[PDB]
Amino acid sequence: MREIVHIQAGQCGNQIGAKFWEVISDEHGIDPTGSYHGDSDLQLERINVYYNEAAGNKYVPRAILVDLEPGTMDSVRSGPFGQIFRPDNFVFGQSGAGNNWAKGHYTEGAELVDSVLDVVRKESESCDCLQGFQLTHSLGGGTGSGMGTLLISKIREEYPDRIMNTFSVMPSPKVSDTVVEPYNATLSVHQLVENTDETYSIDNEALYDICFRTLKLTTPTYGDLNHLVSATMSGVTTCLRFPGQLNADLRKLAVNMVPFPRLHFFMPGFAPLTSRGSQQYRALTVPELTQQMFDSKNMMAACDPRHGRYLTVAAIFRGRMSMKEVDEQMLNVQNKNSSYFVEWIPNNVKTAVCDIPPRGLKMSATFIGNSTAIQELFKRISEQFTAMFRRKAFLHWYTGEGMDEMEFTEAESNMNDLVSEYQQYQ
Amino acid sequence: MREIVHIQAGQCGNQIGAKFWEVISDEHGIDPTGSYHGDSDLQLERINVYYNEAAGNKYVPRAILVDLEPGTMDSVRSGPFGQIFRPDNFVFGQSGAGNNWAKGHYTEGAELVDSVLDVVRKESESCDCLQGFQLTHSLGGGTGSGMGTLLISKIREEYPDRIMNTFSVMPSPKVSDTVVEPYNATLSVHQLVENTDETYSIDNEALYDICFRTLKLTTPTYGDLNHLVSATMSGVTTCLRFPGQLNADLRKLAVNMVPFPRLHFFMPGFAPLTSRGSQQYRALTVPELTQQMFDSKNMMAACDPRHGRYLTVAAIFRGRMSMKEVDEQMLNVQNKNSSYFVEWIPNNVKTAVCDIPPRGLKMSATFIGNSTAIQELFKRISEQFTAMFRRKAFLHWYTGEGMDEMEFTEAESNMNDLVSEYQQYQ
Amino acid sequence: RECISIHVGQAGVQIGNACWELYCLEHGIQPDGQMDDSFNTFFSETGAGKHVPRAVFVDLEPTVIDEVRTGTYRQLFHPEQLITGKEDAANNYARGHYTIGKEIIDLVLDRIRKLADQCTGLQGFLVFHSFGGGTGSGFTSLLMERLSVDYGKKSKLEFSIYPAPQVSTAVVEPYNSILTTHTTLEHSDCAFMVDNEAIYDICRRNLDIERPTYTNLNRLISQIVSSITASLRFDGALNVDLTEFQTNLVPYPRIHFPLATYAPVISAEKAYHEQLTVAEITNACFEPANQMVKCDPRHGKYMACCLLYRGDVVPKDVNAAIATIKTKRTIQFVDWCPTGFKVGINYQPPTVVPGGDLAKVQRAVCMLSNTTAIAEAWARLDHKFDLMYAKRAFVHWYVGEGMEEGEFSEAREDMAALEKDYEEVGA
Amino acid sequence: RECISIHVGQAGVQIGNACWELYCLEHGIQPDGQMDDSFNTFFSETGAGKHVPRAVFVDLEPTVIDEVRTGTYRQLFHPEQLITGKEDAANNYARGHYTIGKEIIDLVLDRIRKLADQCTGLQGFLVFHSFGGGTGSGFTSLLMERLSVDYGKKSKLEFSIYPAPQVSTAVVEPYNSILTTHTTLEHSDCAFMVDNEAIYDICRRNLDIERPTYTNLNRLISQIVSSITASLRFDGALNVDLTEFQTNLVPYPRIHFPLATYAPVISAEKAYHEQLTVAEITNACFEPANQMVKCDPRHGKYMACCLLYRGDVVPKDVNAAIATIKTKRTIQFVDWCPTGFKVGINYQPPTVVPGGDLAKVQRAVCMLSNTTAIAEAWARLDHKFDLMYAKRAFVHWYVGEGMEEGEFSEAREDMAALEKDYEEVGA
Numbered sequence A, B: 001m002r003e004i005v006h007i008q009a010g011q012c013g014n015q016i017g018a019k020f021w022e023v024i025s026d027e028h029g030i031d032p033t034g035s036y037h038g039d040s041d042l043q044l045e046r047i048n049v050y051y052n053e054a055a056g057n058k059y060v061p062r063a064i065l066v067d068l069e070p071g072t073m074d075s076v077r078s079g080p081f082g083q084i085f086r087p088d089n090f091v092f093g094q095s096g097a098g099n100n101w102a103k104g105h106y107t108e109g110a111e112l113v114d115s116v117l118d119v120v121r122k123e124s125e126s127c128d129c130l131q132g133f134q135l136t137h138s139l140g141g142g143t144g145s146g147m148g149t150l151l152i153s154k155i156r157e158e159y160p161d162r163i164m165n166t167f168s169v170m171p172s173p174k175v176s177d178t179v180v181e182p183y184n185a186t187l188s189v190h191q192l193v194e195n196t197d198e199t200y201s202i203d204n205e206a207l208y209d210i211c212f213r214t215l216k217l218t219t220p221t222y223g224d225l226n227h228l229v230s231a232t233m234s235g236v237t238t239c240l241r242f243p244g245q246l247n248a249d250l251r252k253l254a255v256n257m258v259p260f261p262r263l264h265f266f267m268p269g270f271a272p273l274t275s276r277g278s279q280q281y282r283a284l285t286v287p288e289l290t291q292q293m294f295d296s297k298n299m300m301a302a303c304d305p306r307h308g309r310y311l312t313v314a315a316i317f318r319g320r321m322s323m324k325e326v327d328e329q330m331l332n333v334q335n336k337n338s339s340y341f342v343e344w345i346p347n348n349v350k351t352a353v354c355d356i357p358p359r360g361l362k363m364s365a366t367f368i369g370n371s372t373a374i375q376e377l378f379k380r381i382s383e384q385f386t387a388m389f390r391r392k393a394f395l396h397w398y399t400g401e402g403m404d405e406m407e408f409t410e411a412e413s414n415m416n417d418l419v420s421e422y423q424q425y426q
Numbered sequence C, D: 001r002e003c004i005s006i007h008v009g010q011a012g013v014q015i016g017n018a019c020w021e022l023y024c025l026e027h028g029i030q031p032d033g034q035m036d037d038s039f040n041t042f043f044s045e046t047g048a049g050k051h052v053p054r055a056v057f058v059d060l061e062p063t064v065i066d067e068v069r070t071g072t073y074r075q076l077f078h079p080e081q082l083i084t085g086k087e088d089a090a091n092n093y094a095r096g097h098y099t100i101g102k103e104i105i106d107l108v109l110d111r112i113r114k115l116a117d118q119c120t121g122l123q124g125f126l127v128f129h130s131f132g133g134g135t136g137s138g139f140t141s142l143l144m145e146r147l148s149v150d151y152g153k154k155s156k157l158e159f160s161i162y163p164a165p166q167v168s169t170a171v172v173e174p175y176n177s178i179l180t181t182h183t184t185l186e187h188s189d190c191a192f193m194v195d196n197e198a199i200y201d202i203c204r205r206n207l208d209i210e211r212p213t214y215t216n217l218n219r220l221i222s223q224i225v226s227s228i229t230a231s232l233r234f235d236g237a238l239n240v241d242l243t244e245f246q247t248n249l250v251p252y253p254r255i256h257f258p259l260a261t262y263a264p265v266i267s268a269e270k271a272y273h274e275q276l277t278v279a280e281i282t283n284a285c286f287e288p289a290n291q292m293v294k295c296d297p298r299h300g301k302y303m304a305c306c307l308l309y310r311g312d313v314v315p316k317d318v319n320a321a322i323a324t325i326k327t328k329r330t331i332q333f334v335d336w337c338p339t340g341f342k343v344g345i346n347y348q349p350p351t352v353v354p355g356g357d358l359a360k361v362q363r364a365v366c367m368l369s370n371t372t373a374i375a376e377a378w379a380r381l382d383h384k385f386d387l388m389y390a391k392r393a394f395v396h397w398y399v400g401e402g403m404e405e406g407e408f409s410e411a412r413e414d415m416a417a418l419e420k421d422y423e424e425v426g427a
């Protein structure tokens, strides 16, 4: 019932996707081998929405890990939960993209896309009823942006009626671990805006800002950053995995949060985010965590929402709580911040709740935010793209794979179209 | 109900504020860890007026400790009750003021005030109904006088209807541990008179005089001085923390004690103040402690009240007592000292009583006094300010942070306005 | 993933015997040729409990091949791979290319061809030579042109040893350097460079070796060339492939001449007294005196840069380090590439040689910086060439080999065009 | 909170080796370089179980650097931090500044720059030198001007050793003193001073050392310089920061020349017979014979004063002590600053050296007094300079270095302007 086919593209996509299967496996109570050891019966009721029944009560995940290098799969397969994935799903090439959008989109991806499209076809036909696709990729690099965007277009034409979820991390000017990041970012968003109906715009520096201020961890590694973004993936897909007083499917979130077809680039968040020493000095009640969700610190994107206005925001609550407190808290946040909410919509705050909270926490909530402040991250990528493109810097490597400079100009026009669209409704 | 948000600024403010949370925690019966172990049910009835309910029946104080140096928080956090405070409230800079009003008011405070205003906002919104702000600062130094006065002005514009309590210790000529004390004092009172509706003018030498004569302690340290001033803070806030036959809120004290908006600089006191050896040789009855309250020795300011006249005085009694004895004692003190009370007010003595006395004492009372004798402490600060200002001594350090000498002249004019106002009603 | 590394000339093989001793010590390979997927990219599996490198040491003079054959690493290296010539190059670009070059390239070009057939993951090439003489200029340039017509698409990482402005070994070195660069400009995808006097400066102020030799110079070269390929051998938080040095460093196909520098460099007694964290090594690698080539980066502008780390190096602090480098207005990046940084992390730490001069460290960094600072070095190399070219000095040897005055002028105007591009791109 | 301390000249390093032995003994640091937040302001964490100071001993002559390298504190100090020159200053302000100064400042200015990058809480600077010669006058003054243009805002605490009226070591000392003070007047935020004959008076009448040496002189200097920073290292009832010496002592930006004196000073056998409480040390520190500089405070007026205590010192009694000092009409404060007192308390007591001349005490005080009493000392220093300046004595050495008669007159009239200000402010 409403099966979602998972897909992991790129190095970062495989890492956060690996953490996604790890964190939800503990919620359902699955061993690393693949057997069920959960305590509640509701954990097994909606286990088929990601997993498949196998012999010996084993549950294999529908994770199609794709990458243009072989070493990435060795780290994922040799992980704690690396042994649960299917060996047939591990399909990969030999030659990497080398941080080039053209290689993964024309040459390295075209020879591999014929092999992976057969893998997703058999997985989609074996399900009872397909709901959507959950993608994890990165706008940086070549395999994530080039090949990861290309497979969605093939899946778009094959399944035009089904939704498309994409949890896409994107670069920032303060934290930039790649020289050719704006070209990969500017070309990828041209393909994402036409194909993907949903896009969670996550920024790396915000995850560094979240771990530094509210969590105050001493030595945050990449694994700690994956725990934050993986929890947001488990939070959006909570209503179709456990019962709740007000269920909201992933399509139900899309109808509420996508007022126009191009305005599907949102600002995710997660709460509570507390340190180990500051847990005793905090109440788990609903009003204190609600203001934390709407705070600029908790959001996983560098754009301050006070520089813009919210189009429409969603708060998918979890745990046993009072509905009146949820209904009254969503009122006061928009009342005393009416300047930061659009006047041409009477109510912008979507809400949902579930009965089964995460393991180790009694109550929690996940923030999804559509606002005009997200255009600030696009224009800084645009001026970085325009600064390097106006003298044809670092383009000759892209032209080797048959790519033309007109497509760079077309991606620049779409980038100008994105920032002007969010400025219209501001 | 009527929550009061506590704030601690400066080195001395954090010390007396730390003693304030220590002494009232014993009255309510709170462990240093944060759990409740009180004997009476009334202790827990009004525990929410300062503290907040948390998990495991833990009670966190609403103490926002602010200081421009990090070492001050390490001494407070490493204290006996340092572990009960919230780690999020410990917000502080790195570079100290170095005893400069301009640094804490323009440069060192301006970069930090944006961070602390977010801390008091979330604490004020989480309460049921905000009553006022209880500040602890010192007119000496830069962080207490410069930054401590600045945050009140931001809180004044944000909460103009709420009262503002400030327990402000100020220097004296006999006990002066700072060379640049009159500049910090003269500039701070200019901001206090316009913003603060309440100000307890405490003097350090009087606390040395109180501990020497009536207490006769052998080796009084700063911790013993904090016990005196901390008890006065617990005494004023007794009526809204325990039941009483005649309750008087902090706003009720303001209407009775503030006859004009600028005449809000009072002379606090506390009684009984007895030595360990002179306890058996003393009766705890009400008439003997009443004359001790109106005595010049018990008052915590260097100004002798016999050099002036009382505007209006308040005596917040505590413990089970006879109301007739309280009503008859307040009559005879003003009858046989009619020269020291203004004739243009028929009754100057406010009174209040509570049923639950402090722990270890059966009966007690706290003296708050408005009198024209307080101007003596202002003019000695004025002539010290005028003596150093008339040749521009020690001003070039203040001008480095963009401060002008006109503001020093404006503070001098306000200082002349204060002493002339109290002379009008004398 | 696999790669092969050839060596040419005296400078190449003296790096080859000095770097391969470090490679065999990392993977626990004893000197006798024996002790899973970490050593596969450099060493093959020779049946059972035995390995062999994928390398060939070729030189025209036999002075250097015979000592490796009778040295201490006799069983590690294959005896047939050690190719030896018959006649010396004699610091002549023409003699090592045409007379002696043409009769020996047919053996080595077919050898590396069949040596690639047993391989399957050949990522590219990296060569080691020096244009300061004849073998590393003539025979190398003939090898690059004949390999580019066969493979072409595969990468080539040139590691040449250029002379200092005033310090030198030969006297006819700019003729060999200017003639071979006419062919190396178009056939090389990337070419890192090293100077002979700058590397003495590395060991003088920091390591305090007042009497060093070429043995000590090659050990820190081995740390450099092994660090760039450390991502392929061992897993890391952010792995970088050998082809990453082509896309992220080459803005234009003819501007492919970056610099090199490495840190930390510290002696034994100083290693225990000095603190080792990512801050000072990030401040030290951009230091102009700690560079491996004599060029002042303050005069020029950086086109592209790439930072690769080793050992326990978390990612949150190194991102803060480069942020402090950007706001530092001492150096200045070019406006054509504001995001001129490529970060790389690896968990495997830097190793040390038994009895080596370098001390053990928990972390390190290798800084390869692309900039226009080499333009003044080329103009100085061209400036000294014009004085000797005007008097026709040392010309009778080259024309006696078969060449003439034509390619002398073609190398001059081609070097002039290289200067014309570096001044145009730096605007 | 952190700070760095450099040392210049023979006087600086002889204080440096003498003061750092006291710092390592307070924090339990053994002489071999190893044994939480108390030693962080002076000593860094060198990986694990090892520390290093944040200091540099620089001197042009090599006589003083080699003995510290081969002394007993070999492992404590970093070997690279111990900078040594090539040529002697020879008691010439010009020679240690321009000829020998210019070739060595480029090493140390860049060294302290990168030494601050690993630091984060740099409060200011404190230097140790002496204007009685060449290195502490020329090289120091070049260091102060080149640091003020780079940092500027940070504080600088100068500790110079000035000569007595009649007792002296050199013969051309007023030329070095008057020339370097022209630059030190504007670049120094505060400058404490010490005399060479007064400190002998401290150990003669009180400590009863009839045959002292410079080793004994520096140990009580270490008590002084360590007491002013004792508030930063350990907690106290009233902590005072290093920047407190700028606001509470400098009434005007060019009048920044306070005196210094310290008490108690008592021998071993006299420590047990004498009572030690806050009264007599407060009476003794204002005693004119117990001062560290030969100036009569009875002739002048105090501009500002600051009292900092150590050990078990309660606040109620010290406030009574200063009240007795104010009513005492022997001394007299200036009318421009009636509240001329700054009290400071610290719980950590004064330590003693193993085998040192100073005895153990439960409490102590360090009295730095700002006054106009140095005006007669400067006029006496200028008076003796006019006799030698009129005959052009010792002028051929300085003009042989490169200077001329211009800055001689500029230093004279600038010193005359300093006298004009101290007589104007004392009205």
Ligand SMILES: Nc1nc2c(ncn2[C@@H]2O[C@H](COP(=O)(O)CP(=O)(O)OP(=O)(O)O)[C@@H](O)[C@H]2O)c(=O)[nH]1
Pocket: A009, A010, A011, A012, A013, A015, A016, A068, A069, A096, A097, A098, A099, A100, A138, A139, A140, A141, A142, A143, A144, A145, A169, A177, A178, A204, A207, A222, A223, A225, A226, C237, C238
């Ligand atoms: N929050 C996390 N971010 C990561 C992680 N790994 C990488 N990244 C970030 O994503 C950026 C680019 O993503 P990738 O590492 O996947 C580059 P990709 O694999 O797609 O191309 P190639 O490796 O060249 O084949 C990268 O520069 C990091 O800023 C991670 O584990 N967690």
Ligand SMILES: Nc1nc2c(ncn2[C@@H]2O[C@H](COP(=O)(O)CP(=O)(O)OP(=O)(O)O)[C@@H](O)[C@H]2O)c(=O)[nH]1
Pocket: B009, B010, B011, B012, B013, B015, B016, B068, B069, B096, B097, B098, B099, B100, B138, B139, B140, B141, B142, B143, B144, B145, B169, B177, B178, B204, B207, B222, B223, B225, B226, D237, D238
């Ligand atoms: N009754 C008490 N008075 C104190 C105490 N500590 C200091 N003081 C007095 O208050 C005077 C100034 O107050 P502070 O110590 O807070 C100086 P402040 O911290 O505001 O500025 P900086 O330390 O320079 O950043 C000070 O000179 C004392 O006379 C104390 O613990 N108790």
Ligand SMILES: Nc1nc2c(ncn2[C@@H]2O[C@H](COP(=O)(O)OP(=O)(O)OP(=O)(O)O)[C@@H](O)[C@H]2O)c(=O)[nH]1
Pocket: C008, C009, C010, C011, C012, C014, C015, C061, C088, C089, C090, C091, C092, C130, C131, C132, C133, C134, C135, C136, C137, C161, C168, C169, C170, C195, C196, C214, C215, C217, C218
């Ligand atoms: N850094 C470094 N440079 C070296 C080393 N060995 C040789 N060189 C350089 O190599 C240069 C000479 O180049 P070659 O063409 O190899 O000289 P050759 O092999 O003797 O050639 P012939 O003289 O013709 O026999 C010298 O200028 C050296 O600077 C070395 O071990 N380390």
Ligand SMILES: Nc1nc2c(ncn2[C@@H]2O[C@H](COP(=O)(O)OP(=O)(O)OP(=O)(O)O)[C@@H](O)[C@H]2O)c(=O)[nH]1
Pocket: D008, D009, D010, D011, D012, D014, D015, D061, D088, D089, D090, D091, D092, D130, D131, D132, D133, D134, D135, D136, D137, D161, D168, D169, D170, D195, D196, D214, D215, D217, D218
């Ligand atoms: N109080 C004190 N003064 C010292 C000490 N060591 C040196 N001095 C003073 O330093 C002065 C000389 O200054 P310098 O410039 O350092 O002399 P120098 O380093 O020998 O310079 P050159 O003679 O040029 O080599 C003398 O007059 C001493 O009074 C010391 O240990 N204690």
